[PDB]
């Protein structure tokens, strides 16, 4: 999962000056701007709260696969906290699989779980 996010950050970093104007070509450049803002907002973190690697890779996969293009950029932190809570609620099977195999879980089940959480989430 790391590579796609790395290329996304590399692409967004060079176009930070485009954000002053909406005259941007929407399909590519504005998509890159939205993706970069979402990725940066995800990458922010608080102090003295380490995150386990399973939850890290879960959130990184969710962000990379474009599932967060709909959530407003000013609610991503709350979204992330609620997603961690929900995963602690019923994602224990995926967490155990990741812990014991160092490998991604089944993509279908992962997509189903993230779709369920997205449905149960409320936009502010």
């Amino acid at each position: 999962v790391a590579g796609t996010l790395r290329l996304d950050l590399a692409a967004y970093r060079e176009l930070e000056a485009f954000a002053q104007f909406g005259s941007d070509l929407d399909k590519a450049t504005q998509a890159k701007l939205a993706r970069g803002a979402r990725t940066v907002e995800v990458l922010k973190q608080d102090l003295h709260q380490p995150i386990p690697v399973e939850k890290q890779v879960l959130i990184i996969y969710a962000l990379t696969r474009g599932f967060l293009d709909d959530i407003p950029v000013e609610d991503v932190r709350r979204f992330e906290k609620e997603f961690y809570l929900f995963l602690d609620q019923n994602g224990q099977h995926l967490l155990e699989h990741i812990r014991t195999t160092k490998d991604l879980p089944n993509e279908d089940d992962l997509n189903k779980a993230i779709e369920a959480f997205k449905k149960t989430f409320v936009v502010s």
Binding site: A17, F18, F21, S23, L25
Partner: protein, 283 residues
């Protein structure tokens, strides 16, 4: 010239070069989007030329004021400029050529009329204390015939033949990216009627001579739209060239700044080392 000063100038020139390249790309997109609008109006022009090519040469209208006749004598001028600032010579070339032609054709200032689109270039003739008849400042980068319809309706309501008989339009014409040429073409009365093909005879049983008074206002508005699209394309070309030159100059400045920075750093470190070793040996 200090080391940190040169560093600050270097990073500032970096960001400025990035911005100029970005706005050059934006101007590229603008020209690409405006060119299809420029080339999508040609069929309407050819249709008007087809419907008019058999009328004046067909002696349909006798002495219509627009049809090669002089309405009430009042000589006016059309000029179109850009309204988003840094374009280069786009505004200056037309505003200079029109002034030079005016200084030989016009009688005296504060007598003739001017019509300007783009306050950025209008301010020149404002400081040149000219009267503004119709002014258009804000419009989309991709204007439509529907958008220009309001200004066209004003242009046929006032400026009409009962009030105005001569116009000379000045604008920049998209000839190449290196330079957009300026031209001076009169609007009314039409100089001559050219034929696109053989005389396709039509039936005018609605009226033989009462179609001119509506057909020719369309001629004027179509010519106005053509001038507008030429001006917009030329503006985008001017922005292209100006921003390309800006980025090139920024890079050229950057290389020399870095060279001077390296020389300064080497001189500072060598002088400091010499001072330290001399101070140590002095004891």
């Amino acid at each position: 010239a200090s080391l940190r000063d040169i560093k600050t100038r270097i990073n500032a020139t970096k960001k400025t070069s990035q911005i100029t390249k970005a706005m050059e790309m934006v101007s590229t997109s603008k020209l690409n989007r405006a060119e299809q609008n420029a080339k999508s109006f040609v069929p309407y022009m050819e249709k008007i030329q087809e419907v008019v090519a058999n009328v004046a040469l067909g002696a349909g209208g006798a002495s219509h004021p627009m049809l090669v006749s002089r309405p009430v004598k009042k000589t006016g001028y059309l000029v179109i400029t850009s309204d988003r600032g840094l374009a280069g010579a786009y505004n200056s070339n037309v505003l200079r050529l029109v002034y030079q032609t005016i200084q030989k054709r016009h009688a005296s200032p504060d007598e003739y009329a001017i019509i300007v689109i783009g306050r950025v270039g209008l301010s020149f003739f404002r400081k040149r204390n000219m009267p503004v008849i119709l002014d258009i400042t804000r419009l989309p980068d991709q204007p439509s015939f529907a958008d220009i319809k309001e200004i066209a309706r004003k242009t046929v309501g006032l400026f009409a033949d009962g009030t105005f008989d001569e116009l000379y339009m000045y604008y920049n014409h998209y000839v190449s990216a290196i330079q957009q040429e300026v031209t001076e073409r009169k609007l009314l009365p039409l100089t001559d009627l050219a034929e696109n093909k053989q005389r396709t005879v039509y039936e005018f049983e609605p009226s033989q001579e009462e179609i001119l008074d509506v057909l020719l206002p369309q001629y004027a508005e179509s010519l106005i739209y053509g001038a507008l699209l030429d001006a917009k394309a030329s503006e985008h070309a001017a922005r292209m060239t100006a921003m390309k030159n800006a980025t090139d100059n920024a890079n050229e400045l950057i290389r020399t700044l870095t060279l001077s920075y390296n020389r300064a750093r080497q001189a500072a470190i060598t002088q400091e080392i010499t001072e330290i070793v001399a101070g140590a040996n002095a004891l």
